[PDB]
């Protein structure tokens, strides 16, 4: 059993304007490709560690796996959390739920456009969902490190603040690209993903 | 008293074909720009915090201070370390420093190129001087926390792995990047500031 | 500007037995008098830091900063928090808060345990008030980082779990020190920053 | 695959005075006890995270990886790192390295002395040998962090500085716990282990 680089859901260029066919061919098949190879690796060379009992082997490891592996985790939700069909507002109980613990949609998108543009260096912005509090939480997680993994929130919509998510396109202007990618999100995912936290 | 963004000491162009143009202008118009005026902006904050005697608000700044006064230390050592005048070996005392503490200057570069690609995120790998031990060192840093403030390590030569720094020409190749930086150290800046280590 | 040690709101034996009074004797008059001493001095060098534009200098003094000051801060948090007539359970609105936010006065019990017991190496457990969400809300911090200058969360009540809170009495096991430290918390303390927070 | 609580090469008072009995005895017996139990637990969750792929998982047990895990590397290295028979100088080739690397006996005492004692929160001063320079280096590490795990060096001589380690006998003066440990130094062992690190 292995990871594989999952298949992007849409053509590179679908996204156009809001990011380019140049990002999205290398973000998937570059940058995600790569993720994916060397947390195979890792994994393996974990595995062997273990056999043998080589804690410091295992410590040594720790970054890759979670670089890569966080890598593996956070792409694969990325792709589906984008759509062509995407943009515009949630309904239904997600919409409920963001206007509830945020108090409104554009407070909810300034908040998670505050927390994305907030990264310094590398790093991500989520929306979560907290399973304790059942309800939504923002956090931003630095460089690769995956929402769920090291907060315990399940990841609803993340937001790649990597220079390489938007840097050909946007340049230095961060919050140039956060502004275009509200209009490409795919809340048929994130509301599928939100409902099945709740039972 | 403020800190000033340095201008550059060659063209934008200067650099070409081993960093491009559009690079050096966005790196040192726009990011190298940015820190300085946030750092500006942070040491006034700090100031009336300490006036005030606000601990939090001092502890609350210590991030953008050491992302932005990092950056602005980082960058204004590294646009000295590059010049149209660079490449090639360096001579007299730092060649016989480098071959006796890594061995030859191929294994030095070797080891600089390691640990600056080795960077998960972004980052930096340095050339420092250890005082106390009276020889060089390598080490790698993580964002912008620059070596001398977080290792005590005398910076002698930078190289910048921030994703900004090659993405347009080289995106996700850093070693590409790595590989034509060599053609444009200058040197005679390196030596420069290993010869005031040594007294 | 010159921050002191604050006397206690009781003598060092008034939480006997839950927290023993050797231990109240060395946590004031030894740690906490040394984050204010450290405090002091290590804001003199920033002053003289910021004065010269010593960025470098700035930075260095970062963790010793942030230890000593998160030391002062959460500290004199912590004295507050504790008393010898407290226990129980509190009153009124707060009590209504930790009840919808944490289903139970003895569930939000179990969960900032169980943050406090969690904390690898030296750290805090807090309950703490998101003014943004405008509810509790409980986290852990590392070291002496200090729960508002890290997290933005309001105070409300911190539990120590550095060893030295606990060690001389409960040896290793941390989980004996959380069950008796409930029987001295201040809920009137604990209130009175809670209402603050609020209108 | 297994890992097992070491016995002691001694009794645990046989550090008396330096450490005394009730330290040794805790030190061993409940907190290494605990880095094994917890090793081992985590070790067999992360077995099963490899089998189901679940990378999450997996990033969620570092933290109790490295601290349990490293809590076993470092602890196992420390007890034979000290001896009844202990204390002095070392002899020979490693006299000779100390001497060179750090200009004398007293003055590398002075310098692992200065980096354990500098430690803010819990973690472990570490004479070490680094493979790539061929000579001696100090460092300082994070709550359990191992030497070589996390920097590549290979462990010599480490001093732990938790709380733990010293707080019983010597409350918050660190400083005299490391000066009462050269006393102890299994100089036999650390001899050893620093040959082991030449061809
Ligand atoms: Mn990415
Ligand atoms: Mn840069
Ligand atoms: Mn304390
Ligand atoms: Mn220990």
């Known amino acids: 059993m292995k990871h594989s680089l999952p298949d992007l859901p849409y053509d590179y260029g679908a996204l156009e304007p809001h990011?380019?066919?140049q990002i999205m061919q290398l973000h998937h098949s570059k940058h995600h490709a790569a993720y994916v190879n060397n947390l195979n690796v890792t994994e393996e060379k974990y595995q062997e560690a273990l056999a043998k009992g080589d804690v410091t082997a295992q410590i040594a490891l720790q970054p890759a796996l979670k670089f890569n592996g966080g890598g593996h985790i956070n792409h694969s939700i990325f792709w589906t959390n984008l759509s062509p069909?995407?943009?515009?507002?949630?309904?239904?109980?997600?919409?409920?739920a963001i206007k509830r613990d945020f108090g409104s949609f554009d407070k909810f998108k300034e908040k998670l456009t505050a927390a994305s543009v907030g990264v310094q260096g590398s790093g991500w912005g989520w929306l979560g969902f907290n399973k304790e509090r059942g309800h939504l939480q923002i956090a931003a997680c630095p460089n690769q490190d995956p929402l769920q993994g090291?907060?315990?929130?399940?990841?609803?919509?993340?937001i790649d603040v990597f220079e390489h998510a938007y840097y050909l396109q946007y340049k230095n202007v961060r919050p140039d690209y956060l502004k275009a990618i509200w209009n490409v999100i795919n809340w048929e995912n994130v509301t599928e993903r939100y409902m099945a936290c709740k039972k």
Request: proline share 8%; no cysteine; aromatic share 0%.
């Open 19 to 21: 990011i380019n066919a």
């Open 150 to 158: 090291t907060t315990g929130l399940i990841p609803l919509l993340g």
């Open 85 to 96: 069909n995407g943009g515009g507002e949630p309904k239904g109980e997600l919409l409920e």
